[PDB]
């Protein structure tokens, strides 16, 4: 029973637009719970799960001012980065940030996170020690030296060990019914004839949460990389997820094939096969 | 509770 919190932040500059659009999204255990967007009429952080309406107006006023601060920080940084990469006016650019904490099932901090990307690529990141920085790009070295000289790492470390953990604990108590549960996958196999003397067996899994899942096919023993087709896990749109995996099989010898579904809601892996 | 950033890039 581990836990996590993240804020995913994005600022996008576009050619003629006056100034960048800034979006921040907060997540508790990988579920969205707050959101700010500078394109709204009255830009404010907003609840995105029912359990967050417990928070009084001082919570929302403070987080909103923080967001407006972040917006200005991303605006100046975008400007600085344009100069660092000798990019000219008239293009589109992106600055992103992930930050947050992971807790063990004892609710102790497992790991802190602080990373940035520019144009969708690693720019700079705080290492797991919460003291040193990784920056690959020559242009990013300028930021690394600046942040090393100002003691930025100490500032982010205090947030990640302090507030991030403290307020995550408070959120986990407040939403203890909503995001404790999981939905087990319900699975079935469909049959689909094809090119003479062969058929595809499609193993479906439906209605599961969270998204993490594995579907394997077995020829009475070993797995199958031998053209096992599959799809990426996809949202149903109602909070659950879907996935399938398939394998080409001789017609008649289809009961030598078994599909297994591995999901954290299951008491044990499901085993399954085609049934007329 | 969201982070607030330190020095700009």
């Amino acid at each position: 029973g581990p836990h996590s919190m993240r804020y995913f932040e994005t600022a996008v500059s576009r050619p003629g637009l006056e100034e960048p659009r800034y979006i921040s999204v907060g997540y508790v255990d990988n579920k969205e719970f707050v959101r700010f967007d500078s394109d709204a009429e009255n830009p404010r952080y907003e609840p995105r799960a029912p359990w967050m309406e417990q928070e009084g107006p001082e919570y929302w006023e403070r987080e909103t001012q923080k967001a407006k601060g972040q917006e200005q920080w991303f605006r100046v940084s975008l400007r600085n980065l344009l100069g660092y990469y000798n990019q000219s006016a008239g293009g589109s650019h992106t600055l992103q940030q992930m930050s947050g904490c992971d807790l063990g099932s004892d609710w102790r901090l497992l790991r802190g996170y602080l990373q940035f990307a520019y144009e969708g690529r690693d720019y700079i990141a705080l290492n797991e020690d919460l003291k040193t920085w990784t920056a690959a790009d020559m242009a990013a070295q300028i930021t690394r030296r600046k942040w090393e000289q100002s003691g930025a790492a100490e500032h982010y470390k205090a947030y990640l060990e302090g507030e991030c953990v403290e307020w995550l604990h408070r959120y986990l108590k407040n939403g203890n019914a909503t995001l404790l549960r999981t939905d087990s996958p319900k699975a079935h196999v469909t049959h689909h004839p094809r090119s003479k003397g062969e058929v595809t067996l499609r193993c479906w899994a439906l209605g599961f949460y969270p998204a993490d899942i594995t579907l394997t096919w077995q020829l009475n023993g070993e797995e199958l990389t031998q053209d096992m087709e599959l799809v990426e896990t996809r949202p149903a749109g109602d909070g659950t997820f879907q996935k399938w995996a398939s394998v080409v099989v001789p017609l008649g010898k289809e009961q030598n094939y078994t599909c297994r579904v591995y999901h954290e809601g299951l008491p044990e892996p499901l085993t399954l096969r085609w049934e007329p | 509770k969201a982070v607030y950033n330190f020095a700009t890039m």
């Binding site: 994005t10 576009r14 969708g120 499609r202 996809r234 149903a236 749109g237 399938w244 | -």
Partner: protein
């Protein structure tokens, strides 16, 4: 630099002809975040398509879920058409009820 969108088109519920349902178009793994997504019935734009908010994955790439109400039939065909700077031309994928 550009990451090309991966697209899946599928229904929320098991498809049954004549039964209201929701058609999804899940667009993932793209950069930059500007993108046009249309869902199509028989070649033609479906007018009131719901669009989730811009999000991104831990690899930094963006993703979106477009969806709409629909009632599948034997004869109508559905699809999703994505325009993005990573592609010279739009990409269409067709709803297949068995996938």
């Amino acid at each position: 630099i550009q990451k090309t969108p991966q697209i899946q088109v599928y229904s929320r519920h098991p498809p049954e002809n004549g039964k209201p349902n929701i058609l999804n178009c899940y667009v993932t793994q793209f950069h930059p975040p500007h993108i046009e997504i249309q869902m199509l019935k028989n070649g033609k734009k479906i007018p009131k398509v719901e669009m989730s908010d811009m999000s991104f994955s831990k690899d930094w790439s963006f993703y979106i879920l477009a969806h709409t109400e629909f009632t599948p039939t034997e004869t109508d065909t559905y699809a999703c058409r994505v325009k993005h700077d990573s592609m010279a031309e739009p990409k269409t994928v067709y709803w297949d009820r068995d996938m």
